[PDB]
Amino acid sequence: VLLALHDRAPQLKISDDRLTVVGEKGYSMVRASHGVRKGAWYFEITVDEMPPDTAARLGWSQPLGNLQAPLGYDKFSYSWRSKKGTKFHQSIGKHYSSGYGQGDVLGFYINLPEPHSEIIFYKNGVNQGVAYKDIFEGVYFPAISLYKSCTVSINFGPCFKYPPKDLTYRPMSDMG
Amino acid sequence: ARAEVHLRKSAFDMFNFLASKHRQARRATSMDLPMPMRFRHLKKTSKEAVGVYRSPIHGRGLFCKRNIDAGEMVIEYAGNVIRSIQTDKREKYYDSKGIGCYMFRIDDSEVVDATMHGNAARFINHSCEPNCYSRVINIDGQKHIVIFAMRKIYRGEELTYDYKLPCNCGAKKCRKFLN
Amino acid sequence: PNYALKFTLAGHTKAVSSVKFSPNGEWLASSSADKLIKIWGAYDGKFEKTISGHKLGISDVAWSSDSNLLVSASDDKTLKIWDVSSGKCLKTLKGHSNYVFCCNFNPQSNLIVSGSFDESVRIWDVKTGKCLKTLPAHSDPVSAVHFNRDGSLIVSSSYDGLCRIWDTASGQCLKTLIDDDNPPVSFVKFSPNGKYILAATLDNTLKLWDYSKGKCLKTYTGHKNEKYCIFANFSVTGGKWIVSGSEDNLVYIWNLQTKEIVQKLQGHTDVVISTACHPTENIIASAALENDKTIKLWKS
Ligand SMILES: Nc1ncnc2c1ncn2[C@@H]1O[C@H](CSCC[C@H](N)C(=O)O)[C@@H](O)[C@H]1O
Ligand SMILES: [Zn+2]
């Protein structure tokens, strides 16, 4: 699955096989070229190599967020901190959820019937904070903003490692 | 005199320069010497060619005491090189704090702020008939906001360029729009 | 904590400009803007003399360490120098473009700091009277300055919330006491060791700042100080009392150990702008403005 060529942050370390996302300094959020629209689409973000002191923000975001936006700047992008699970969305300070562990197969899901959303930080099908609810109708980009240069994978294979349990997602072999 | 408790007390200014006085080819930037020589000359000589004094145009300014030549380098606008969305955060912040916002950019990716980190190029007023402009140069992979001159800028003349909002420029070519 | 009223130093014709003790602890003299620096005693209020010979009113008179030499911050924009001993027109020293509000001395008794309303702290000479330097102090007039234990620093009481600890010898801003608020800073002074700062900002709250660290430790509650530049003091002769003037016709004296209302003295009929402490014994200067014109000898 080919990643983004123009609608991303080209200074970030998107790999040459186009299956591995590595960030840099400054919260420029690389967004993949496959924004979900409707039905049920779930991809994984297989975290493999990540040093400590990385607030690896993972979640969902709309195209009206900036390429240089932090994941959790405005009313369109969610937020997920490693330290104490503190979420910042619509610029609201909520020491709300839990963080994550290193090596966990991440990858989140937002529920788009063709409205009713399921915005929970899906780490291996385990709750890491029931985040938000009641999105609008539109395109929702993949959303990865990083503080350091950590080496995490992103999965588009239909035989997923740890999806949400009893998720009737469409397999990602129809996205590209 | 101890009885008339008077007003005009607080200034809301982080800098306090308003004293009683406030007394307002050889060089490589005018030579055909290469751009690293000009850029190495610029940081060493913008500290000693110009100076910050109190501005009748607006606030405090950049009053040179030297016949600045035409087309040469004057000063480098160096400050907080923040991301383009940290611009709106610091704009809301220094709207909440009252400190004047200084955000001139190189491009549409990251904008140089000049509020916490800065230099004497914060004290550059705007004249709609100015004596300088700017060009984006390239040094060692980095880009630098460099204020190139236009004409022979005399002793005592305050330094202004084109920023590209009613101004105190005093010129007859006035746009009154800086967006 | 039993300061008792003893005498009344009556005779003033205008608002009493200052009531400060002499450095020998034996002459609580006083002055006003009526060109009458009324030299009084300390224990009974016995009359000694009265200095006159100005053109306009008088803002500040400051004590030299021999209890004799008096510089006058007179409102004719002069620095007329006078004497407890003689009272001769020693040096009339003009120069300031606005009213010379306050004046102080170094402990070496050889410099004349001049806190005027002209936004330029100039320094003058005791022997002849040359304008020594001119500090680019503030965009605000000066209400109060002080030297440290030797005279090497100048603290500022600006009006936009700035207490710049100025150098004296080289004369540059060494440390700027920063505040996100910009209160009208009224009367600052160094600690008697020179290592702590009592910044009297006008928010009904005195602020004791450290000089080394720089953060506040203790404050005070339940006192009226918002409009006038009310002087504060330090007293260790009894307890650790802090003598200050009042606006609701009191004598504001409380303790740094208490920080609250534990002792009040009373009897004035105007705003007490100047207070002072006797250095060894328990004599406290208390005198208000034009609607009082009396000096009240409190004594424990
Ligand atoms: N020529 C001019 N006339 C009116 N406003 C100007 C101006 N040049 C710059 N400005 C605006 O005024 C602000 C300068 S701050 C004023 C100068 C300095 N801070 C001081 O007073 O000491 C800037 O934010 C700028 O946008
Ligand atoms: Zn203008």
Q: What is the 3-state secondary structure (H, E, C) of B125-161?
A: ECCCCCCEEEEEEEECCEEEEEEEECCCECCCCECEC
CATH class of A1-176: mainly beta
What residues contact residue B115 under an 8 Å CB cut-off, 6+ apart? B79, B80, B90, B94, B99, B100, B101, B102
Question: Who contacts C200 (Cβ-Cβ below 8 Å, separation ≥6)?
Answer: C157, C185, C186, C187, C188, C206, C207, C225, C229, C230, C231, C232
Both tokens assigned to A49: 């190599």
Nearest to B3 among C15, C139, C161 (CB): C15
DSSP symbol at B39: H
The set of residues, in sequence order, having a beta carbon less than 8 Å from that of A175 and lying 6+ positions away, is A1, A34, A41, A156
Residues in Cβ contact with B89 at an 8 Å cutoff, skipping those fewer than 6 apart: none
Q: Which of C223, C275, C271 is nearest to C247 (CA)?
A: C271
Cβ-proximal residues to C29 (8 Å cutoff; 6+ apart), any chain: C20, C22, C37, C38, C39, C40, C48, C84
Q: Which residues contact C155 (CB under 8 A, 6 or more apart)?
A: C145, C146, C163, C164, C165, C166, C188, C189, C190, C197
Q: Give, as residue ranges, everything with CB less than 5 Å from ion ligand 2.
A: B 167, 169, 174
Give whole-number Cα distances, A50 to A123, B62, C59, in Å.
Answer: 15, 49, 70
The helix, strand and coil proportions of chain B, stated in percent and rounded to the nearest 5, come to 15, 25, 60
CA distances from C297 to B156, C22, C42, C267, C283 (A): 60, 15, 8, 11, 7
Query: Do residues B117 and B111 lie in contact, with contact meaning Cβ atoms separated by under 8 Å?
Result: no
Structure tokens at A153: 């994978």
Strand ordering across the sheet containing C185-190? C185-190, C196-201, C207-210
Q: Output b/e per residue, B48-86; b: 16+ Cβ within 10 A.
A: ebbbbbbbeeebbbbbbeeebbeebbbbbbbbbbbbbbb
Return the bridge partners of B146, or none: B76, B135
Going by C-beta distance under 8 Å and a sequence separation of 6 or more, which residues neighbour residue C115? C100, C101, C102, C103, C104, C121, C142, C143, C144, C145, C157
Q: Determine which residue's CA is closest to atom 16 belonging to ligand 1.
A: B59
Instruction: Check CB contact under 8 Å for B11 and C101.
Output: no
Would the annotation count B125 as a binding residue? yes
Resolution in A: 4.5
Q: Which residues have CB under 8 Å from C46's CB, separation 6+? A: C40
Q: Which residues of A115-127 are buried (b: 16+ CB within 10 A; e: fewer)?
A: eebbbbbbbbeee
Contact B12, C69 (CB under 8 A): no
Is the dihedral angle over the CA atoms C3, C4, C7, C13 positive or is it negative? positive
Q: How far is Cα A30 from Cα A57, in angstroms, rounded to an integer? A: 11
Residue C13 corresponds to which amino acid?
A: T
The Cα C71–Cα C69 span in angstroms is: 7
The amino acid that residue C29 corresponds to is A
B42 alpha-carbon distance from chain centroid: 15
Instruction: Read off the tokens for A22.
Output: 């590595």
Task: Tell which CATH classification among 2.30.30.230, 2.130.10.10, 3.40.50.620, 3.10.50.40 matches the domain C1-300.
Answer: 2.130.10.10
Radius of gyration for the alpha carbons in chain A, expressed in angstroms and rounded: 15
Amino acid in the structure at residue B178: L
Question: For chain B, what is the total number of helices (H) and then of strands (E)?
Answer: 2, 8
Q: What angle do CA C148, C150, C151 make, to 5 degrees?
A: 65
Q: Where are the domains of chain A?
A: 1-176
Q: Kindly tell me the burial class for residue C178, based on how many C-beta atoms sit within 10 Å of its own C-beta (0-12, 13-18, 19 or more).
A: exposed
Cβ-Cβ contacts under 8 Å, B16 against chain C: 138-139, 160, 162
d(CA B76, CA B79): 9
Q: Which residue has the tokens 């400050």?
A: B79
Query: Do residues C149 and C158 lie in contact, with contact meaning Cβ atoms separated by under 8 Å?
Result: no
Tell me which method was used to determine the 3D structure.
cryo-EM
Task: Give me the residue label for tokens 């967020």.
Answer: A65
Distance CA C216, CA C186 (A): 17
- Domain locations in chain C as residue ranges: 1-300
Q: Following CA atoms B114, B120, B126, B128 in sequence, which dihedral angle do they give, to the nearest 10 degrees?
A: -120
Q: Where are the alpha helices (DSSP H) in C35-166?
A: none
Angle, CA of C237, C241 and C180, to the nearest 5° = 135
**Cβ–Cβ < 8 Å for B78, B145:** yes
User: How many whole angstroms separate alpha carbon A28 and alpha carbon A12?
Assistant: 8
CB contact under 8 A, B2 and C228: yes
For residue A27, report the distance from its CA to the centre of ligand 1, in Å.
31
Contact C75, B1 (CB under 8 A): yes
In whole angstroms, how far apart are CA A140 and each of A76, A105, A120, B99, C227? 9, 21, 15, 37, 59
Question: What's chain C's Rg over C-alpha atoms?
Answer: 18
Give the number of residues written for chain B.
179
What 8-state DSSP symbol labels residue B43?
A: H
The nearest CA of chain B is from the CA of A70 a distance in Å of: 8
Q: For residues C273 and C293, is the Cβ–Cβ distance under 8 A?
A: no
Task: Provide the token pair at C53.
Answer: 């010979």
What's the residue count for chain C? 300
DSSP string of B79-118, one letter each residue: -EEEETTHHHHHHHHHHHH-PPP-EEESSSSEEEE-SSS-
Beta-strand pair B103-105/B110-113: antiparallel
User: Can you say how many angstroms the Cα of residue C53 is from the centroid of all Cα atoms in its chain?
Assistant: 23
Q: Please report residues of A whose CB lies closer than 8 A to that of B109.
A: 68
Beta bridge partners of C44: none
C280 CA to centre of own chain = 19
Exposure of C142 in the CB half-sphere (CA atoms within 13 A):
33
Q: Considering only CA atoms, which of C167, C173, C164 is closest in space to residue C140?
A: C164
Q: What is the DSSP string of A50-91?
A: --SS---EEEEE-TTS-TT--TTSSTTB----TTTT-EESSS
Ligand 1 proximity of B159 Cβ (cutoff 6 Å): no
